[PDB]
Symmetry: C2
Subunit: 135 residues, 2 copies
């Protein structure tokens, strides 16, 4: 039904059996999504220039593209402001703010393995989901 | 004449006398630029929610805005690919790729204090400048 914007923390664990068990059916159904910044974070995992090309081909084959509206910069600033008094603005990574803003714009959950997405969602009220139960 | 897109590595050193000596005249002349992502990285330095607001007001008063075109995501991916064989894709931060793409789009140098901008410029041939001589 709804797609999930897959965050690095889950993608980098796609090889673990429980995580694969969740991600493979979503992928086969076309329910995993990517955007500009999640592709960039995925590209860090390349092991050669050609492998970076292989990874790009995989991502374009396996995850549905969603656009990044130009509102993400201010939205991320708003979220960062709301995280500041608790001090989370110094630990929540800038790319994760952008990912959250993209997912919120499209009305899709972020699928992740990082409590920081729960810290963002406490502010935005947007849907987020652990790829597998954290415990 | 030309503006400079100010990167975090220089902004975070604005209090050092040599750096202030370079940045204050540029600021007074309206020659320092900001974009969505450089403002986000600056916001990490806030020391309270209200201070985050103070910092935002300062940035809007002190640095000229430039837009972030939707081409930055693919441009950053291209740069990351060209950094991959040397291994720099695993150390050059995603926000710095975006900053470089913004500056390149606008034809303005990045003003920085991080050799990673020189690694990017070796690929793109775009202008970059140390805020003060690195040595």
């Amino acid at each position: 039904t709804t797609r999930y914007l897959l965050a690095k923390s889950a993608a980098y664990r796609a090889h673990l059996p429980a995580v694969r068990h969740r991600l493979e059916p979503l992928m086969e159904r076309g329910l995993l999504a990517r955007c500009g910044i999640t592709d960039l974070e995925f590209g860090v995992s390349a092991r050669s220039r050609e492998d970076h090309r292989t990874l790009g081909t995989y991502r374009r084959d396996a995850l549905e593209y969603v656009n990044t509206p130009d509102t993400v910069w201010v939205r991320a600033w708003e979220i960062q402001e709301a995280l500041t008094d608790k001090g989370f603005h110094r630990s929540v990574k800038i790319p994760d703010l952008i990912i959250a803003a993209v997912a919120e714009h499209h009305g899709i959950p972020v699928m992740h393995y990082d409590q920081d997405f729960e810290r963002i969602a406490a502010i935005t009220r947007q849907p987020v989901e652990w790829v597998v139960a954290p415990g």
